[PDB]
Design a protein around this ligand. Structure first.
Ligand SMILES: O=C1CCCc2nc3c(cc21)C(=O)CCC3
Length: 282
């Protein structure tokens, strides 16, 4: 079926939970043996969210190459994304090592450091120009260059320096700051505006390594971001945009990381975002 009318048909019939459970039943199951080794227990935020072995990102280290991160490679759309958990106190250096080694231009953050009174990820970037951060375990230096605070999101320019080679690179930090503590946003308008700002920066384009996107577990809000982007790109590329099937795209992405889209409300929000976004594109 088309999307917008399939949408009203699920609303009128109140069957979002049944649609979402079908997706969960059909999703791929692949091994995640490296994630479950005992030496990696303090590298995982949640025991039930792990990268598949076949698609995990490997650090270029011979001691321990493990990070909770996955490469989602979308062949028809010609887009790649790295989805990862919010960094932990003992993985902030690994996180920036990955950003360096994979040649990423942008980092997309969809959570606040504290939500619901609890810490959802480490404070992994510097907050003042004159107070830079040094990650001694991976030999990297990170400096805040500039910061632009808007009503729904903040963009930061960062400098990452490989202290071994003295090479430097500019990284863009795109921070969506207004996702509610419970539920999903009422309108997709500000999320779509944010997606378009990431696009316009070049961070999603083939001349850079894959964008790094995270929330707390790296599957819910993060899944919503890459699902909406890929679906909109396919609607631009194909002769028949109504052929784009958001459930099929989501199942393809779930071949590369488990659990993408965590609730039936997030599924409905993803439909809403693609539907509204397809009208603005033209
Ligand atoms: O933010 C939105 C909402 C509607 C869809 C949309 N499409 C475009 C933009 C922005 C948005 C741009 O600024 C450049 C490319 C076209």
């Amino acid at each position: 079926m088309e999307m917008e009318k399939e949408f009203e048909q699920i609303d009128k019939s109140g069957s979002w939970a049944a649609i979402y459970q079908d997706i969960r039943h059909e999703a791929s199951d692949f091994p995640s043996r490296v994630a479950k080794l005992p030496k990696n227990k303090n590298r995982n935020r949640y025991r039930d969210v792990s990268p598949f072995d076949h698609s995990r990102i490997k650090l270029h280290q011979e001691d321990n190459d493990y990070i909770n991160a996955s490469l989602i490679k979308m062949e028809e759309a010609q887009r790649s994304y790295i989805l990862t958990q919010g960094p932990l106190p003992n993985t902030v250096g690994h996180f920036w090592e990955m950003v360096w080694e994979q040649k990423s231009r942008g980092v997309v953050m969809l959570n606040r450091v504290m939500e619901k009174g609890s810490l959802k990820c480490a404070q992994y970037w510097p907050q003042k120009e004159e107070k830079e951060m040094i990650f001694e375990d991976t030999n990297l230096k990170l400096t805040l260059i500039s910061e632009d605070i808007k009503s729904y999101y903040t963009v930061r320019q960062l400098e990452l320096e490989n202290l071994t080679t003295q090479e430097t690179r500019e990284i863009l930090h795109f921070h969506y700051t207004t996702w509610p503590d419970f539920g999903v946003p009422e309108s997709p308008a500000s999320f779509l505006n944010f997606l378009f700002k990431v696009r316009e920066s070049g961070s999603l384009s083939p001349e850079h390594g894959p964008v790094v996107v995270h929330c707390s577990a790296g599957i819910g809000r993060s899944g919503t971001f890459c699902l909406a982007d890929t679906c909109l790109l396919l609607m631009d590329k194909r002769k028949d945009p109504s052929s784009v099937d958001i459930k099929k795209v989501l199942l393809e992405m779930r071949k590369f990381r488990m659990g993408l889209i965590q609730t039936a409300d997030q599924l409905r929000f993803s439909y809403l975002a693609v539907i509204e976004g397809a009208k603005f594109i033209m």
